[PDB]
């Protein structure tokens, strides 16, 4: 089972967004890079801010794609076919509405369940791509989804999903030496403390 070489987080650029829901990816990618010292650069080639780095032994690259989230496919695809980085040897962190601050699941395959970042990409590379969905709550109805996705989160969700990202980057090591089921059971347990 192939080894994780590529971690991607999903966002919007710009200091407006930087602290939006819809920027979990972003978060975990960026907390991610500064854990292992991996400097994240302008990378336009790519329509993206990309890094290239040792992660527990692997060689690992970090994107965030600067599309803006609809777009995203617009770095992945050329960035993942540019390095020759099959899909199963991507992860890609994103805001997950069907799941409450705290929980967090990686998954494999499956279609973009809404989701307008995974939307513009599973079309080009297919979906057998991991995912690690970051919990970020539904605010209720489908008006109000928008401005949810869109809005920064009250300070007790938000320590809820850093917890939760928090584990996440613990199981990092897992993932990219290629231990996929172990790191799914380990990430889908968690339960707030």
Not at 29 to 55: M, W
Not at 59 to 65: A, I, N
Not at 84 to 103: S, Y
Not at 175 to 180: F, I, K, N, R, T
């Amino acid at each position: 089972m192939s080894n994780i070489s590529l971690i991607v987080g999903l966002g919007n650029p710009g200091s407006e967004y930087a602290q939006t829901r819809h920027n979990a990816g972003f978060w975990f990618v960026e907390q991610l890079a500064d854990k292992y010292g991996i400097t994240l650069k302008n990378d336009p080639k790519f329509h993206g801010i990309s890094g290239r780095g040792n992660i527990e032994g692997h060689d690992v690259r970090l994107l965030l794609p600067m599309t803006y989230m609809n777009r995203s496919g617009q770095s992945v695809v050329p960035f993942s076919k540019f390095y020759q980085i099959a899909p199963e040897a991507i992860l890609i962190a994103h805001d997950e509405l069907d799941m409450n601050p705290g929980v967090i699941r990686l998954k494999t395959g499956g279609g973009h369940g809404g989701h307008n970042g995974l939307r513009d990409i599973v079309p080009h590379i297919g979906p057998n791509f991991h995912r690690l969905r970051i919990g970020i709550g539904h605010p209720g109805s489908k008006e109000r989804v928008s401005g949810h996705v869109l809005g920064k989160a009250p300070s007790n969700e938000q320590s809820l999903m850093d917890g939760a990202i928090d584990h996440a980057l613990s199981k990092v090591k897992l993932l990219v030496q290629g231990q996929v089921p172990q790191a799914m059971n380990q990430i889908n347990a968690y339960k707030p403390a």
